[PDB]
Amino acid sequence: APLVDNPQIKSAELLRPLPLYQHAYVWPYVIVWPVFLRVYLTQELYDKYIGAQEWTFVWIISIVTFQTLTWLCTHWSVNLNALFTAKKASSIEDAQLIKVIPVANAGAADICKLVRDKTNISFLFQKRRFLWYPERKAFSTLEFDIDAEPKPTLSKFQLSRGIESEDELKRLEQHYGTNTFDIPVPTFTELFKEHAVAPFFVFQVFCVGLWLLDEYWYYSLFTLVMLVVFESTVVWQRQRTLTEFRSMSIKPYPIYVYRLGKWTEIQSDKLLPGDLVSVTRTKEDSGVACDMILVEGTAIVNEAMLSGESTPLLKDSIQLRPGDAVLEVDGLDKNSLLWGGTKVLQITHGPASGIPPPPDNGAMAVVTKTGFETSQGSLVRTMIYSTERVSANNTEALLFILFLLVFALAASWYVWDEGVRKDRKRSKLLLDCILIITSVVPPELPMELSLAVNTSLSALAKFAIFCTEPFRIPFAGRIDVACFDKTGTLTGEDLVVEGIAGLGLGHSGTDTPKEADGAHTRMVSVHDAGMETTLVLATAHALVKLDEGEIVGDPMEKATLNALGWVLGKNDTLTSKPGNAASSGILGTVQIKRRFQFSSALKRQSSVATITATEVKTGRKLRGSFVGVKGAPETIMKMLVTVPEHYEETYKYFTRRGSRVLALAYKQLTTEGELGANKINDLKRESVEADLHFAGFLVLQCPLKEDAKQAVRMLNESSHRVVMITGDNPLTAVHVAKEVEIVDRDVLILDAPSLVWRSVDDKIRIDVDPTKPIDPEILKTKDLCVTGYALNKFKGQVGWKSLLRYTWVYARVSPKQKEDILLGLKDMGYYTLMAGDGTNDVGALKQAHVGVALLNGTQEDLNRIKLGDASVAAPFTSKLRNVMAIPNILRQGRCTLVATIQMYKILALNCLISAYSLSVLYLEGIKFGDGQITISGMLMSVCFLSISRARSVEGLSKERPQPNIFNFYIIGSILGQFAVHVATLIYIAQLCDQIEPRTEVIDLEAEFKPSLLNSAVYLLQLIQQISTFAVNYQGRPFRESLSENKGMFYGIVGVTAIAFACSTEMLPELNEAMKLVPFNENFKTIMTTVMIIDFVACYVIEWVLKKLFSDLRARDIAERRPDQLERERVRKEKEAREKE
């Protein structure tokens, strides 16, 4: 039943083409036209319904407008395109076009074209290839070799020899296509012809024609030029954005491919699935071209494109895997796949197919996916084409236009009534009414939200912050909860190894110092540690040495290797042959054989090695196989053969001061000799990580960043709420949150000893039940810290809705529970922001409304050298290590919202003034001069150019701007200022009528003549437009003030001075340039007083309404107790006093 089987495609229909003479805009008009021609050619029929020669133009324009509208309706809407041109088709045997309409907020619908090849029916939608499958009777996406419903056996990949037939090569090239990113940038002509059909560009040309019909030959040229240059700059912006998106692809580089039994040199854009390609060390500005699965050798890679981490990963082959009867899974073999867009740092070798090695001596891999179907390719394709636009709904600006159109319709109706009461000419009156109707619609009101976003993006890219989805910028103006991370986001990257603690557990030491609770205080340095501790520190690590001579890995592993004193070798060997205090004994060698890599959900890392070490002071020679494990103390505790007495108290005491505690464990498989080549590959993770003994805790110290406290204090006192979602110990997280002032009261930790409330000093213990609700006093008078175990056990009970509102510090959460917390906070109505820098938060970054991936990198790297280096893990990306980048996003979104509101108000108040001035001028039959209205338009354009310059303040304020148009701040201010302007204009028109009487005779001559009413109305409307620009400049509490910047203040002062000099008749040449009449002194004085009163009333109304209704209140989760407000006020007063 469904034609297209895809979650992101709603409807699809089959259509057939039709000839040109059968379209919906040919036959009805070709049957209507001869009827009108016969009516016009008939003399007796010409008198009735055609009238004079004037209404003939009206009928011709009407029929031509209907024909042009019918033609353009096929371009405006896809449904009308299918209805008019195309015709429904019965079966797939007779079909050439397909109408495809996607799901909401997933791009634009279209009419794709079927293609047939030899049987094989396919088409393209949003640069994605869909194929017709006759068995399922539906269209679906391409099916690859690794995505078969029965998972392929590993003998298919191990014994593969590449494509060996040229016919199969041609078939694969036809089926899948080349390995290129199809992102074409078109020229100016194509973009202009695509943009000159839009419904708001035809309307302005129609308005230009309407003005040209009324003998205005200087205004129409000016507005046509302005419209042309605006469309040109929009086209240039779109082309620049498309070029920036195009700059993400990888330039092709030569590679070696096994084809037809020989190693050939093929460019990187001519790769097909099933190829056997030799990989080597990649260069700068190049990555892996396509997704591959390794079959021989080992690689050391850096997957910075798909995750924010930059620590290298050790990919191994599937050569040793017994895949004769074992089906391939992606869970166990996740360490053998090379993704496209990553960099291969190192190739090491440490076959079943029976092929010679490649000439470049690289590893061998088998291609799996090519083109847009890779992970990076799919992410880029979704980013570019199928994404929500900046103004998706457009159901509020198009109603605001109708709101103005109601006023214009009322004015036009009154004009028509008062014109037909006095028996005026019907054609001129109809043209005046149409002009009044069409002179109220702002041209770019649907815009001015998609125009400020580009300026915000440029300002952000100044700060090295890049955004790939620009429709999330307004969301940053409404953030209510701002989540964070502990290690790598709020704490520094370098670590100092304090030492090894708890070596005396198990009654190893008798006179060791001990506190009241039983914790062992004494801490021993790494040099003076035991032999087993030294070997478990050396063995359980993932540090590799490049051929240049550098060491790369996790910072804590580099730190513990530097503190240990041992030296890394080329073939995964560590030795301490020199005898000195730097080696501190324990001399020997350690050679690693197999590694079980660290996983965030497992919280441990194990390693198997062959050791041969001796202790100098007490002998105790050791040799043979050995296995070392390091991880979180809670995880290691469950795997010990016997837990020592004071384990929990010791690690709790050592983590209470803010340190980081890692637990080590060791086991000896064989006492003498190696385990064996076959036995090593037969080991499993579950079997090797059991029955371990104990080694001392490694104690690290993570230093806080210099910008963490300032950024968090900026976020906290600006109607935001900041929470921490970490995976470290609850006590370390509580200490860090207390240091950065996230929590300021006593803290209670909800954790199993099941699910008890505990104090940080462990003097309060309260039992709670998962089913019963939380105690109200605990919520009222305590600060909460909810672990991962309690959050897991509170999955479906009633407590879940009350924890997420009263918890600021979540600790010990797996990467799935982070996205669980984010989804739970998003489902209650709040807006969330997440800032992470790791693979833990990748799931969480793609669920929050705003996602920042802090790519920790130095400024010197940028000085040595821009969407190429940016990743695709989060929509936002900052390339520096400063926490202050987060406020710089929430300030830019706020400025975007403020500028949008001010532009809406300015446009809506500038259109109505012109409409109701033309309405007043058309009651007496006189009209504006050509030069006067051209000068007014040029001055308004200059004012718009001058007011567009605006900067931002250096701090966040407590006032949140309104996010939408229909509030009680925009509507009320617009109506009040409109009423004031209307009252002043009506009063001055009545006074002009009183001073100079009207002859009530409108002659046939329509040549413009100078008059008092025309000059007064023109001067008043100019001054009113300038006052509207000067008053509604929304830049007092969020941007720079009006008088602080000369760029617009000088222009406003100059325009007002010129207008008042024209009013005061100081320059008669300027008065005669715009055809102004001489004034008497009393009229000049009364007009000046009227203008001053108008400006003062508008300013007072705007100020009152801004001070009353502009502030959108903070949510209930962001409200602060009076104690914190008092502390903030006291600290701010002290800072102000100590400033000078």
Ligand SMILES: Nc1ncnc2c1ncn2[C@@H]1O[C@H](COP(=O)(O)OP(=O)(O)O)[C@@H](O)[C@H]1O
């Ligand atoms: N390279 C590593 N080797 C062993 N254990 C680690 C390593 N990295 C982190 N751990 C431990 O895993 C636990 C969970 O860490 P995780 O939540 O994955 O990241 P983070 O420590 O940034 O929150 C931590 O308590 C830490 O002690």
Ligand code: ALF
């Ligand atoms: F320190 Al983390 F997720 F990076 F808890």
Ligand SMILES: [Mg+2]
């Ligand atoms: Mg992190």
Ligand SMILES: [Mg+2]
């Ligand atoms: Mg990490």
